[PDB]
Amino acid sequence: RPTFYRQELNKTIWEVPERYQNLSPVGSGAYGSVCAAFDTKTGLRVAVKKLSRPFQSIIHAKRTYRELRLLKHMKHENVIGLLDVFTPARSLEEFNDVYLVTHLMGADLNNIVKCQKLTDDHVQFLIYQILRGLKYIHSADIIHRDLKPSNLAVNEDCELKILDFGLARHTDDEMTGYVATRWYRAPEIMLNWMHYNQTVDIWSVGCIMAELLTGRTLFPGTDHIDQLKLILRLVGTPGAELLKKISSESARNYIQSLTQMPKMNFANVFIGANPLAVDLLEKMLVLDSDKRITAAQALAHAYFAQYHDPDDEPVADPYDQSFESRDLLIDEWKSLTYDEVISFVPPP
Ligand SMILES: CC(C)(C)c1cc(NC(=O)Nc2cccc3ccccc23)n(-c2ccc(CO)cc2)n1
């Protein structure tokens, strides 16, 4: 057991092993706070996420377990990995705080789209890495659901990792109005059309790729309805087949009220884009999530010829999320989390 030291930062106590030095706040939210630090043991700049009151409720307790379980499983160059997890507690009885540690990235995809003039090759490399990470995430039957620039960490060499800050609740209020929290969402998740699948993340990739290509938000709606209309203007109103898969009868009836529109010509929307980019966008930005290209399929698309290596695009080890449907008390979620803390083995 390491020695822990105590510090206050923005009204939050941080109690961390001495190995972590020069803690500096970088983000806060309902579910936790994040600091940058220097890990004297590895020589790495790290981010440390302290969960806020992890076992205060069943929902917090289960979220705490869920993130730990997930991060412990993620072992891929394009996905956040866990360097360390610790607690100041010496026993289960004492156990009340959880801290998670990863590589500091400090620089997201927003810090790239708005600043740099990105070439087509940059776009290839960035999207390639997203899809390479997504293939891995999706092979574990994990859906990101919230893919957007601020959830993509990018270093100076344009190396990318998928993460999820996951500090915010995603309430109705949070999804309301002219907000980036909604602009990258698949319409079926935005409007709760149906039970959704992992293709939701592909829609988000299309929105991100478009924006890297144009420097502009693809669907910057001023609200849910305005965003839907921007979407349908580009991709066409739904046909018969898709309409019946919209199981929310209310949503179905609204969408049939809309004046039918054809899918636009993407070469006329993305003027001057590599025609292979255009083709990939048309395959990603498909209204019907059954017909969207998957991450594995997209990696093999000619747009990525310069990067694709089918022997270097690994899948995940089997991930058992049977716990997701398990009905447990706070203290049971807590004891499971504790087992996971205690059994963590750091990367080589
Ligand atoms: C694997 C993937 C799907 C991309 C994912 C990644 C994460 N969590 C994080 O990325 N956590 C962290 C985000 C930012 C800084 C951190 C700095 C240090 C450590 C972690 C950190 N989650 C996540 C899962 C579940 C929940 C709660 O249900 C919240 C977040 N999911």
From Swiss-Prot:
Chief localisation class: cytoplasm
Annotated compartments: Cytoplasm; Nucleus
Keyword Phosphoprotein: yes
Cofactor(s) required for function per UniProt: Mg(2+)
Activity control note: Activated by cell stresses such as DNA damage, heat shock, osmotic shock, anisomycin and sodium arsenite, as well as pro-inflammatory stimuli such as bacterial lipopolysaccharide (LPS) and interleukin-1. Activation occurs through dual phosphorylation of Thr-176 and Tyr-178 by either of two dual specificity kinases, MAP2K3/MKK3 or MAP2K6/MKK6, and potentially also MAP2K4/MKK4, as well as by TAB1-mediated autophosphorylation.
Tissue note: Brain, heart, placenta, pancreas and skeletal muscle. Expressed to a lesser extent in lung, liver and kidney.
Catalyzed reaction equations: L-seryl-[protein] + ATP = O-phospho-L-seryl-[protein] + ADP + H(+); L-threonyl-[protein] + ATP = O-phospho-L-threonyl-[protein] + ADP + H(+)
Residues annotated to bind ATP: 26-34, 49
Changes after translation: Dually phosphorylated on Thr-176 and Tyr-178 by the MAP2Ks MAP2K3/MKK3, MAP2K4/MKK4 and MAP2K6/MKK6 in response to inflammatory citokines, environmental stress or growth factors, which activates the enzyme. Dual phosphorylation can also be mediated by TAB1-mediated autophosphorylation. TCR engagement in T-cells also leads to Tyr-319 phosphorylation by ZAP70. Dephosphorylated and inactivated by DUPS1, DUSP10 and DUSP16. PPM1D also mediates dephosphorylation and inactivation of MAPK14. Acetylated at Lys-49 and Lys-148 by KAT2B and EP300. Acetylation at Lys-49 increases the affinity for ATP and enhances kinase activity. Lys-49 and Lys-148 are deacetylated by HDAC3.
Residues bearing PTM Phosphotyrosine: 178, 319
Its EC number(s): 2.7.11.24
This protein's domain notes: The TXY motif contains the threonine and tyrosine residues whose phosphorylation activates the MAP kinases.
General function of this protein: Serine/threonine kinase which acts as an essential component of the MAP kinase signal transduction pathway. MAPK14 is one of the four p38 MAPKs which play an important role in the cascades of cellular responses evoked by extracellular stimuli such as pro-inflammatory cytokines or physical stress leading to direct activation of transcription factors. Accordingly, p38 MAPKs phosphorylate a broad range of proteins and it has been estimated that they may have approximately 200 to 300 substrates each.
Name the UniProt record assigns to this protein: Mitogen-activated protein kinase 14
Organism name: Homo sapiens
Organism classification: Eukaryota, Metazoa, Chordata, Craniata, Vertebrata
